């Protein structure tokens, strides 16, 4: 896949269809509900009877997030149906290419991480499951503070599995959202 194609596959893989949305709910509600999985980049909710259509397309900044929201979102809110944009099929080959590639790094995604924790803490907390090759938390450029999520590459596959199975929904005051990475480190490259 070309640098551009991979950049377009990642974009689609971060989109999640949300349906059965009560008519009295707006993007702010949806946003808050899915935020646990990674900061929400944008929301595309389609609205002469200015009310909407109870479906939205939430777009995360990284596909790993979309992957988790889909696995953990089957809550009420007014019930809702989660799925994927029916056009991913056009980027499926690459998406599969990114999947195959991802399996070479015992890479894991970690969302909903408290502002006070740092790359160290997270590292500290996670190395308990195995030697950690890399441990970094995404950060805001204009600030520098982590965006509440990051990635952790383990030395051993077993280590990343133990980490995942043990930390998904781990406390404190919030619940961490963890799951295996669905993409390699530099997706647009090769």
**Ranges of each domain in the chain:** 1-105, 106-190
SS3 assignment for the chain: CCHHHHHHHHHHCCEEEEECCCCCCCHHHHHHHHHHHCCEEEEEECCCCCCCCCCEEEEECCHHHHHHHHHHCCCCCCCCEEECCCCHHHHHHHHHHHHHHHCCCEEEEEECCCCCCCHHHHHHHHHCCCCEEEEEEEECCCCCCEEEEEEEEECCHHHHHHHHHHHCCCCCCCCCEEEECCCCCCCCCC
Is the distance from CB of 168 to CB of 86 less than 8 angstroms? no
Q: What resolution, expressed in A, was reported for this entry?
A: 2.8
Q: In what order do the strands lie in the sheet with 132-139?
A: 132-139, 146-154, 106-111, 177-180
Q: Which CATH superfamily is domain 106-190 in?
A: RRM (RNA recognition motif) domain (3.30.70.330)
Instruction: Say how many C-beta atoms besides its own lie within 10 A of residue 31's C-beta.
Output: 15
Strand partners, 16: 58
Beta-carbon neighbour count of residue 7 at 10 Å? Answer: 13
Fold assignment, 1-105: Alpha-Beta Plaits (3.30.70)
Identify how the structure was determined. Answer: X-ray
Do 1-105 and 106-190 agree at the fold level?
yes
């Amino acid at each position: 896949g070309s640098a551009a194609q991979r950049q377009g596959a990642l974009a689609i893989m971060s989109r999640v269809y949300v349906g059965s949305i009560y008519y009295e709910l707006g993007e702010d509600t949806i946003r808050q509900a899915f935020a646990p999985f990674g900061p929400i980049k944008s929301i595309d909710m389609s609205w002469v009877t200015m009310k909407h259509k109870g479906f939205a397309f939430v777009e995360y900044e990284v596909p790993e997030a979309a992957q988790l929201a889909l696995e953990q979102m089957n809550s009420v809110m007014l019930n809702i149906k989660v799925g994927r944009p029916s056009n991913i099929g056009q980027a499926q080959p690459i998406i599969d290419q990114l999947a195959e590639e991802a399996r070479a790094f015992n890479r894991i995604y970690v969302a909903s991480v408290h502002q006070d924790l740092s790359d160290d803490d997270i590292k500290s907390v996670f190395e308990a499951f195995g030697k950690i090759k890399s441990a970094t938390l995404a950060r805001d450029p204009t600030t520098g503070k982590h965006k509440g999520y990051g990635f952790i590459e383990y030395e051993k596959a077993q280590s990343s599995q133990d980490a995942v199975s043990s930390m998904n929904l781990f406390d404190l005051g919030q619940y961490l959202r963890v799951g295996k990475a669905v993409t390699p480190p530099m997706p647009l490259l090769t």
